[PDB]
Amino acid sequence: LSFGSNLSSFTDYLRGHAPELLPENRDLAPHGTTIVALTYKGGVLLAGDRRATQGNLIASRDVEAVYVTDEYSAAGIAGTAGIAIELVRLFAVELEHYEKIEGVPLTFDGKANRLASMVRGNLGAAMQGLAVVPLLVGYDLDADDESRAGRIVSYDVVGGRYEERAGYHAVGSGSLFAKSALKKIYSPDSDEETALRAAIESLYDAADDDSATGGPDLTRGIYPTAVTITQAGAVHVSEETTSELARRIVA
Amino acid sequence: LSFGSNLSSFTDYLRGHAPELLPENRDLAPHGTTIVALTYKGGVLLAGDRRATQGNLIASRDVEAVYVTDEYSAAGIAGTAGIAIELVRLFAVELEHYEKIEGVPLTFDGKANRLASMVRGNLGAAMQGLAVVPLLVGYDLDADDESRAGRIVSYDVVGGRYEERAGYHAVGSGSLFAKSALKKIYSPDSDEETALRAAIESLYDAADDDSATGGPDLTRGIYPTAVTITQAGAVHVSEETTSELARRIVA
Amino acid sequence: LSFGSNLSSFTDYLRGHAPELLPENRDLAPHGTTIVALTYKGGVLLAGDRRATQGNLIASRDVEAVYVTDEYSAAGIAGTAGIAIELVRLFAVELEHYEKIEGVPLTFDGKANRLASMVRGNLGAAMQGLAVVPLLVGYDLDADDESRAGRIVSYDVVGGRYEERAGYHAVGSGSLFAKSALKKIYSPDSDEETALRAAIESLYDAADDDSATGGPDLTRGIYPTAVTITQAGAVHVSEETTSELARRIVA
Amino acid sequence: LSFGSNLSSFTDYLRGHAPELLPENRDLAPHGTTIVALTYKGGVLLAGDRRATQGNLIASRDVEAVYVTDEYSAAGIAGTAGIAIELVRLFAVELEHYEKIEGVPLTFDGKANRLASMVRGNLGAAMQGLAVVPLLVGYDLDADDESRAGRIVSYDVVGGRYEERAGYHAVGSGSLFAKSALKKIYSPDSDEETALRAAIESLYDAADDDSATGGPDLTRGIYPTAVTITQAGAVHVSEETTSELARRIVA
Amino acid sequence: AEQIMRDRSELARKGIARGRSVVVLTFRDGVLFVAENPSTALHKVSELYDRLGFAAVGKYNEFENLRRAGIVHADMRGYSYDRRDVTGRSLANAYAQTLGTIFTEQPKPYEVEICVAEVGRVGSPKAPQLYRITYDGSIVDEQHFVVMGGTTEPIATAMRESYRADLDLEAAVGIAVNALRQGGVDVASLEVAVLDQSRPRRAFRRIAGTALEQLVPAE
Amino acid sequence: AEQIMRDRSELARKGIARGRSVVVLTFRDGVLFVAENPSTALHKVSELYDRLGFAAVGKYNEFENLRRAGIVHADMRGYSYDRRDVTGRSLANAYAQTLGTIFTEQPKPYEVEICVAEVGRVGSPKAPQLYRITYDGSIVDEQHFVVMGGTTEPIATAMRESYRADLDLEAAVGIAVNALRQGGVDVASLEVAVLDQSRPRRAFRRIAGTALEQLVPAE
Amino acid sequence: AEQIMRDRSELARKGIARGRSVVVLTFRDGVLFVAENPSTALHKVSELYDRLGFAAVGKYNEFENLRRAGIVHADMRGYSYDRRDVTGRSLANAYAQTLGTIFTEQPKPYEVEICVAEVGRVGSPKAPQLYRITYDGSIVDEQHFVVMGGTTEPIATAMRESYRADLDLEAAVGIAVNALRQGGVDVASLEVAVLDQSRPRRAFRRIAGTALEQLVPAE
Amino acid sequence: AEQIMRDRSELARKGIARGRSVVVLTFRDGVLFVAENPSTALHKVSELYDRLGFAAVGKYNEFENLRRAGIVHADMRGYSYDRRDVTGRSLANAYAQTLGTIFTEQPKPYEVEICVAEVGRVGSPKAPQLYRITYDGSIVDEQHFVVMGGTTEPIATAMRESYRADLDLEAAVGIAVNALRQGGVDVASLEVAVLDQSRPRRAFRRIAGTALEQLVPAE
């Protein structure tokens, strides 16, 4: 029975006991959805589309793109769906294992630096068309402004990480449009419902020009997935809160 | 004599005692058939065509594409026949060995997560035209709704897995057509005979537009293979039940 | 002195003591002949052509393409002659060694599964134009119908195996034609002489449209090679029985 | 627990305990900003743009391209942002660890020679379009002329290093223009404010002809990042000092 | 100073000396496994393959390891050839070789004794077979019954003159449960399993409590 | 000169002999962990997985290593299959095998004793399970309580006749805190944790000081 | 303290000392194998190759390993060259080298004694050959008969003055079955096999029970 | 012949027995390091990380190696996560594990005793923490002071009844410099350093001679 990683990194363990499980070692597959992240009074939130496309075909219409990675942080990942899923999973275990070992959770930055390490491992698959890019949000427990504790970190395909601090950000095909809508309808410190509304709205605007998106659809009943993180922790928004906010947006 | 895998994984054993047997290490060959999966009252079912094609040629007309992987789960695999066969076999041993070791069977999700691991290993052969994609169904013993215990999981070539929850799904050349027929003739919670009838019918409709399929043929006596899984377990449907349901469908 | 393979596999032994001898590690050369297999009352039989071609040239006209692999099974192999020969040889040792070790012979299916393993190793050379495909027949000792004990198994280049159960099958350039002749002149349960006659006849018909074949030739005295397998075992048919049956076929 | 590097090099440690972390082992991503370095009376300074571009798109507008690598030295890095960031980080640890081990800091030249070693490792990624080039500045503690203690070192992609001694230098897309502006407005030994002013000005001139730059922007409030190094050490210039000097430059 | 084998042998014999016992026997349905085991979480009897069973005594972790090693070895063979090529004789020999090596090289010998039980295919009229492997790597082929664990002498004879062919299931459970009583009290606090030849595939089945009550005689 | 195992065994038994003790028991909410520990930085009880807990006694660095080894092993299984396939039985066996090997080959045996505690899923009505693994690689499956560390005899009996089902939390804390008092003074200078089955996922929770005050009875 | 070889030698000689015996002899048809063996599952005589036979005594798992080792070595040579290049002399030398090394380096020497029997090709008039290899790696080339296992002295002489050329099959079975009786009762509870030179290829054949009855004389 | 650990333990205890001593204590500003050291080239106290300090006694090269090993381990963690995730607890545990292994396997145990000191972040009101690791791999968490090296008993008590919270810097230097005097003369021929929590990043600072003069009291 192995004694684990010297750095308390589940990843580092695999690196020396099961390399096969790492990304490093390994449209023809469905790809990632558009995902938006907003900062607000309490904490931060992530809202993701549900459209998974492969070619011009719609592969799935109930894709959950946002995950709660840990008590005070969640992340969405766009790109090759398969790769994305595996990546976020490993990331979660990474964080949780560190805690069960060290008895303490990782700093937000620590968590962000790890995600980079992982993305950076997929660089090979990235260059071959199987790229994936995550969007990380979290309630920085070691922060001063309990009002500005929410943070958003974007990524490269080469493993770089970036602090957003613009109040919002996006990733995925519609990201371009979504971000531009937020540039207009997004207001700084505000309700958790105001921000969540702005998000669900930006996905509407993204769906307008991006066929790979097509967010809220009242007729078919397809609604965005969301997750909010505040001093209380990370929680999954209910389909009700979503669909409701969706109809309200419509005129 | 080796003491086996630390994780009780037959695969993991091969990984370190007989790497050659793994997929990871290795039209010019016949390829996989169309396969349909339906969810219904009792449990779930899988029905597969029998046509194996290589080029425009028919290579086999009695191909069994559905296998009982374990007491409460079966799977069909489409793509390079040779690869497919080997894959499903290994998958079965994987499951069975885990049980004989741990004294307990794997959770359905556990079983699905393993199948992914295996598919993911074939990603190299996939990218070289020797891809294979399975369709997994099972009676979730750890489920609440004993009526909704049936589940269907589809796959990527990169190892991703997806929960279907639409009542039906398909894979293989005719998959496209078959799914579209089910979109119309498939009714939710229903007889095991109603669902099995819908399936055999969708294979008829797939055969209409896909030359790689050509399902039920009353003249030659070629009938679909099926397998049902319910609280009683997984059982092979008889040629009678099939051929009979086949004729009844015809007008 | 090594203690042998843990699985009693001569192959597995080479795999770890003399990798160089395995196929895995390694028209510009003469290639394999057309070979036919028929099932009948007693057991099964294999009949093969004698024409080995390299380019448009005839390289050999006395090629023995059918071999007795073991007391109750024989196989023919078509494709790069050199590779083919080595492959069948190894296969024989594989079977025989298992017996001398375990004190028991392998099940027919076991024997077929091994042949696959071997073919599967040549997949690399296959993809480079040095492919070879065997045709395995045997008297299944563990069978119920002592009349249906005969079996025919065909192969892929990727290592897949298939149960024929159509009464006959073929491989090699003329295989296409030969099979089509058997579709007409082949009758189920019948004499060992009736089936052997049908076979030698199908090679005549194959020679008609395939220049890489040219089976029985009364003028030059080139006659097919055959092998029958019945409860008594596998035996080489005599040139007499062949040439005689050959002339009788001619009108 | 490992006893560390024999040469007290953190890098050399990774080289033999965690190769994966090294650059050696590993527009599609945002790339590095324009960076200027000036020598003056007291010490030296580095000023960098904030524009990170990917394609023709602006990826970030608050990129910090200058870092304090150690008490008496800082460096800016242009090229693939992700790679750049990781590189400068490692470089910092490299220096700091050496000190904590040897109890003494590295000579400036020693520090420069290390940076080279690192750049040299990225040569593979460089040749594939993911190149990065740093600009190193420092207050040479082992220098004679306490007035000429400031030094500027430029780099190759193959790991070569060069002593500037021209009073100024630059790197990044606008480097070409920036240098040419300094050729005119840069005066030797002078105020720390005169040099810092010249720098912020050259970034203005670079922004004139380089769309990948666009330095100071009074309307949007985007101002250059700077760092000065003198006998007192390395210190981050304040946004005030920057924005102020920026407006003063404007006519 | 050359017969350390005598010592190592003793270390093992003594370990297997103390600790419960196990009885494996042949009968009408197939093979019966009766072993003294107070626990319900940990086991001493287990399914080896389709027609193979495994039972052991001695130090747990050690015979447990060997148990897994068997499951694996069996599966490997099945995978590589055909499930029908998996034989008790094979695993028996395998074990004999492993224990023999462990005995000779490992620092401390394995305080284990193993029994491999096979039972002909569904149709086949062939009679079940038994194998016993000891800590030093020795094997024997009993066709009637095998005793191991604790003090055997009394239990051995108790069976020696108490065994019969076609011995009914209920009866067999008794034959054994009594051979245990006499020598070394013996309530339904056991682990009983059987290798039912009637079954088409798996053949291994564990006998619960409610069904056991109606099989274990009193004193 | 063959029974060095007797010696090594003694080295361990004596090490675990001195040093504080620990009590793990079953109750209404799930599983209670009461262990003597003056420190607040270092621990003897820890979360193993979602429904597993870990507690040990003996030499720190040694049982600490095993603790990590568990966390990892558990996570691996969860990652490779599903979090729901992670079982106490698995880690228990794992530990049994590890300690057994360490005992046999390592230069100095591990002066450790470990307890693995599992508790059914949120809904499931299944009752918690306990496992104890010793320095030589032996395991047992207690369903009520487990005592280890220091001199057990007195604490064992103190519990032996003081334990009851559905035993309230506050009461249980008492049952144990008293079984400790009598044998081997015992202020709120302990490490107490619990495996609350009411929780949906994590299930492991540490009981602070303020909340402990209202649970630890006096003498 | 240099002649540990004397000891190791003794350990082996004593092991082979106890335990049944075996007789291999030359005759009209080819080579006869008569070995005391109560079992029908495990063997001491086996086919080595086309014209080679193998028989051994001592510790099973050990001589068994060597048996396999031979099958493999023979096959390898046959595969690499031609079946006709496989010779008894080769395997004999091989075995001599292996046992010699095992004796010298392995922790415990192999308590084994081996006999390799060869018989000319179908046509060839050449007379069969025998080889005996001992635990220390020594070999001799007997052309008449070889005795090994248990106490040989009596059986040796019993053959020494009882052997003859062209000795009929039935007679030979007697010659040997008697040499066994006298020294160390001897019913049709043996393992008898032969290397029939009349056969075209395989040459090795096992003699069943019904056919044996009509060959084993009484006392 | 099993308690070689007793011996090895003694070899270490005696090595640490002779040779100077060291005192680490908590106070107003952070953590004080006072260690007897005539040299100015070689050290016994060093910066571990941003908020960590290291001090040791025993054989130089040995505790020196461990010192480096720490610097590396700390940096690795900082690089891999965030400088803020580096904790004394981590290195403490690390060292405990390392010395424990060295003690058990290395040919000669490490004649070393180590102290890891941590001090909360600039703002944070948390009080400094101390850890001591011994040659056998044992650790304790002192919150006031730690004594090691040479004969401790006298120095220990001298501190035991001489320590106070918020103890001024100058005073603390005295408290310790005196506890050293009494037991085992003590001029400004020492190595004194401190872990000043007021500092924003590095936190480790060495106290020179001129500044020390005005801190070390006379006798």
Under DSSP, the state recorded for G115 is E
Gyration radius from chain A CA atoms: 18
3-class SS string, A4-57: CCCCCCHHHHHCCCCHHHCCCCCCCCCECCCEEEEECCCCEEEEECCCEEECCE
How far does the CA of residue D174 sit from the closest CA of chain A (Å)?
A: 22
Instruction: Determine the residue of chain A that is closest to B6 in CA distance.
Output: A1
Disruptive mutation site among C100, C101, C236 for chain G (greatest number of G CBs within 10 Å): C100
Amino acid sitting at position D239: E
Contact E134, E159 (CB under 8 A): no
Method: X-ray
Is G69 in contact with C100 (Cβ distance < 8 A)? no
Q: How far apart are CA D53 and CA D63, in angstroms?
A: 10
Q: How far apart are CA F93 and CA B104, in angstroms?
A: 14
Cα separations in angstroms, G1 against E7, G4, G5, G135, H125: 21, 7, 10, 21, 72
Closest in F76, F81, F90 to B113, CB measured: F81
Amino acid sitting at position G84: R
Instruction: Determine the residue of chain H that is closest to D3 in CA distance.
Output: H69
Closest in A24, A158, A165 to D82, CB measured: A158
Contact C180, C187 (CB under 8 A): no
Domain span at residue E141 reads 1-219
- A126: chain D residues, CB-CB within 8 Å: 28
Structure tokens at B59: 């290579």
Contact A23, A165 (CB under 8 A): no
Closest in A15, A127, A159 to D86, CB measured: A159
Give the strand order in the sheet containing E22-26. Answer: E145-148, E22-26, E30-36, E190-196, E204-206
- A7: chain H residues, CB-CB within 8 Å: 76-77, 80
Is C158 in contact with B80 (Cβ distance < 8 A)? yes
- C126: chain B residues, CB-CB within 8 Å: 28
Give the phi and the psi of residue A103 in degrees, each rounded to 5.
Answer: 75, 0
Is A157 in contact with D30 (Cβ distance < 8 A)? no
- H122: chain A residues, CB-CB within 8 Å: none
Backbone angle region of B79, left / alpha / beta, with phi > 0 → left and psi within -120 to 50 → alpha: left
Catalytic position from the list B33, B39, B69, B242: B33
Gyration radius from chain B CA atoms: 18
- B6: chain F residues, CB-CB within 8 Å: 73, 76
User: Which ranges in D103-238 belong to alpha helices (H)?
Assistant: 108-125, 175-185, 192-209
How far does the CA of residue F126 sit from the closest CA of chain H (Å)?
A: 37
Residue among G189, G59, G196, G64 nearest G117 (CA):
G196
Closest in B7, B117, B142 to F77, CB measured: B7
- A62: chain B residues, CB-CB within 8 Å: 165
Would you report the helix, strand and coil content of chain F in percent, each value rounded to 5? 35, 25, 40
Closest in A1, A13, A93 to F94, CB measured: A1
Is E94 in contact with B4 (Cβ distance < 8 A)? no
Q: What is the DSSP string of E189-218?
A: -EEEEEEETTSSS--EEE--SHHHHTT---
Cβ–Cβ contact G67 with E under 8 A: no
Do G and D count as touching (3 or more CB pairs closer than 8 A)? no
Q: Compute the Cα dihedral for B63, B69, B73, B78 and give only its sign.
A: negative
Task: Fold for C1-251, please state it.
Answer: Glutamine Phosphoribosylpyrophosphate, subunit 1, domain 1 (3.60.20)
Q: How many CA atoms lie less than 13 Å away from F74 in the CB half-sphere?
A: 29
- Tracing tokens 């029997």 back to the chain, one arrives at G117
Q: How far apart are CA F39 and CA D107, in angstroms?
A: 45
Residue among F109, C2, G107, F99 nearest E103 (CA):
G107
- B24: chain A residues, CB-CB within 8 Å: 20
How far does the CA of residue D198 sit from the closest CA of chain H (Å)?
A: 32
Chain-centre distance for alpha carbon G212: 19
- Angle in degrees, 0-180, between the axes of helices C81-102 and G60-80, rounded to the nearest 10: 160
Closest in D4, D18, D89 to H71, CB measured: D4
Reduce the DSSP state of residue A3 to 3 states and report it: coil
- How many CB atoms lie under 10 A from the CB of residue D212? 20
Is E43 in contact with B103 (Cβ distance < 8 A)? yes
Sequence-distant (≥ 6) Cβ neighbours of residue D91 within 8 angstroms? D69, D75, D114, D115, D118, D134
3-class SS string, A86-111: HHHHHHHHHHHHHHHHHCCCCCHHHH
Cβ–Cβ contact A123 with D under 8 A: yes
Cβ–Cβ contact E39 with F under 8 A: yes
Cβ-based contacts under 8 A for chains A and H: 33
How far does the CA of residue D171 sit from the closest CA of chain H (Å)?
A: 27
Contact H214, H188 (CB under 8 A): no
Give the phi and the psi of residue B38 in degrees, each rounded to 5.
Answer: -125, 145
Catalytic position from the list D33, D39, D69, D228: D33
Is H84 in contact with A102 (Cβ distance < 8 A)? no
Sequence-distant (≥ 6) Cβ neighbours of residue D216 within 8 angstroms? D200, D203, D204, D207, D222, D223, D224, D246, D249
Give the phi and the psi of residue G141 in degrees, each rounded to 5.
Answer: -115, 90
Known catalytic membership, residue A33: yes
* Residue extents of the structural domains in chain A: 1-251
- Tracing tokens 């105020």 back to the chain, one arrives at D191
Contact G142, G127 (CB under 8 A): no
Cα separations in angstroms, F39 against D33, F35, F190, H142: 52, 11, 8, 9
- F61: chain H residues, CB-CB within 8 Å: 93, 96-97, 100, 137-139
- How many CB atoms lie under 10 A from the CB of residue E154? 17
- Tracing tokens 């050999």 back to the chain, one arrives at C60
Q: How far apart are CA C53 and CA C58, in angstroms?
A: 4
- How many CB atoms lie under 10 A from the CB of residue A17? 14
- Tracing tokens 């081996």 back to the chain, one arrives at G114
Give the E-state strand segments of chain B in sequence order.
Answer: 35-39, 44-48, 52-54, 57-60, 66-70, 73-79, 132-139, 150-155, 161-163, 168-171, 225-230, 233-236
Q: How many residues does chain G have?
A: 219
Q: Dihedral, CA atoms, B84, B87, B89, B95, nearest 10 degrees?
A: -140
Contact H113, H134 (CB under 8 A): yes
Instruction: Determine the residue of chain F that is closest to H134 in CA distance.
Output: F61
CATH number of the domain to which H144 belongs? 3.60.20.10
Would you report the helix, strand and coil content of chain A in percent, each value rounded to 5? 35, 25, 40
How far does the CA of residue B192 sit from the closest CA of chain F (Å)?
A: 29
- H80: chain A residues, CB-CB within 8 Å: 7, 9, 113-114, 117
Domain count, chain E: 1
Structure tokens at G14: 């004593």
Residue among B210, B234, B238, B211 nearest B224 (CA):
B238
How far does the CA of residue D98 sit from the closest CA of chain H (Å)?
A: 10
Q: How far apart are CA H149 and CA H33, in angstroms?
A: 13
Cβ–Cβ contact B27 with C under 8 A: no
Q: How far apart are CA F99 and CA F118, in angstroms?
A: 20
Cα separations in angstroms, E145 against C13, E133, E153, E215: 37, 14, 14, 19
Do E and D count as touching (3 or more CB pairs closer than 8 A)? no
Instruction: Determine the residue of chain H that is closest to A11 in CA distance.
Output: H80
Q: What's the angle, vertex CA E9, arms to CA E7 and CA E14, rounded to 5?
A: 95
Is B114 in contact with F77 (Cβ distance < 8 A)? no
Do D and C count as touching (3 or more CB pairs closer than 8 A)? no
Give the phi and the psi of residue H216 in degrees, each rounded to 5.
Answer: -90, 110
Do C and B count as touching (3 or more CB pairs closer than 8 A)? yes
How far does the CA of residue H94 sit from the closest CA of chain A (Å)?
A: 8
